[PDB]
Design a binder for this molecule. Structure first.
Ligand SMILES: [Cl-]
Ligand SMILES: [Cl-]
Ligand SMILES: [Cl-]
Lengths: 136, 136, 136
């Protein structure tokens, strides 16, 4: 198997973990108590940092279920975390409901983190796609 | 090549299929007739279930083209389907238009399914990233 | 390493490039000057085309930072680009702010392009998941 190094910047939150072996995502928690009014957005810290491996990407998705059903989502979904980035993971949350505010308590699940391989091609300009080495 | 097992829970819908060999996504259909009013959302069944392989993830994306141009999207995009999950695939659809309802007929394309490899690291807490085995 | 062929359909825009070696995404630019009013959407050309390799997918994501903080996103995020598709990459942008228009100048960063491997299974119908060859 493999590992992902994680720092709890906020030591009072629980350590994120993969609940079941097959689960693509790991839930991340809110470091903040906030109320997001209808149609509004706010950047919320998760209180963790990660060391995504070289050649991979971290992907931050909204969650399904009750959270989605109340209209919680992420403005820039999917959020990306580069191997470079070892700062706090912060999530740009939006309330897509038109009438009902979303109350978020500190410790509440607000997003999930996936990890995948990523290709890192150098972009090479061509004048047209009539070049050797391209898909037919 | 490879295969993905699919169950038609709703036997009266057509079987989803990859239209062209290179297509990343396979279109999924609505099992329901519904009208989504401006700014509203609703959870809609696709009438299918899939068996995502161990070590992979299913990813449910909104479609481009006319659907996107009328403002159809998915609240929690991208939706994820774990190797665990063999229930019906349901899509949390939202109408992002401010004035015009979106009419969806049973059998209409409402999302696309991609399949990718996924990494499944165990999350290991560290006090800081000054540890052996990490990207430089 | 690897390469991705890119055509500048609009020769007056700068060539997109991976800013740092570990960056998952490459920023794409607007070929257009446009103002997106609150809650409105518009399809904007990037002035480039790409040749995604066989067996891979291009993924077009919204960007984090100031763009996300003003409410810029993509209706059908993540946008997908197939190995088939060698036309101009166009982005369905939406202003998720309720009050403040988003001004986009020609040359402004409006999205990022990731490249990943993708699985291309043939979908095979089964009557139930009680079949050989499936995850336990
Ligand atoms: Cl490059
Ligand atoms: Cl874990
Ligand atoms: Cl197929």
């Amino acid at each position: 198997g493999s590992m992902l190094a994680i720092v709890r910047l906020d030591r009072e939150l629980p350590l994120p973990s993969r609940a079941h072996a097959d689960d693509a995502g790991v839930d991340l928690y809110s470091a903040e108590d906030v109320v997001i009014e209808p149609g509004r957005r706010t950047l919320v810290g998760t209180g963790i940092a990660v060391a995504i491996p070289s050649g991979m990407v971290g992907l931050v998705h909204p969650r399904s279920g009750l959270a989605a059903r109340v209209g919680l989502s992420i403005v820039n979904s999917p959020g990306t975390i580069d191997a470079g980035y070892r700062g706090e993971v912060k999530v740009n949350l939006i309330n897509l409901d038109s009438e009902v505010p979303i109350v978020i308590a500190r410790g509440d699940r607000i997003a999930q983190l996936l990890v995948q391989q990523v290709e890192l091609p150098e972009l090479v300009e061509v004048d047209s796609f009539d070049e050797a080495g391209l898909a037919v």
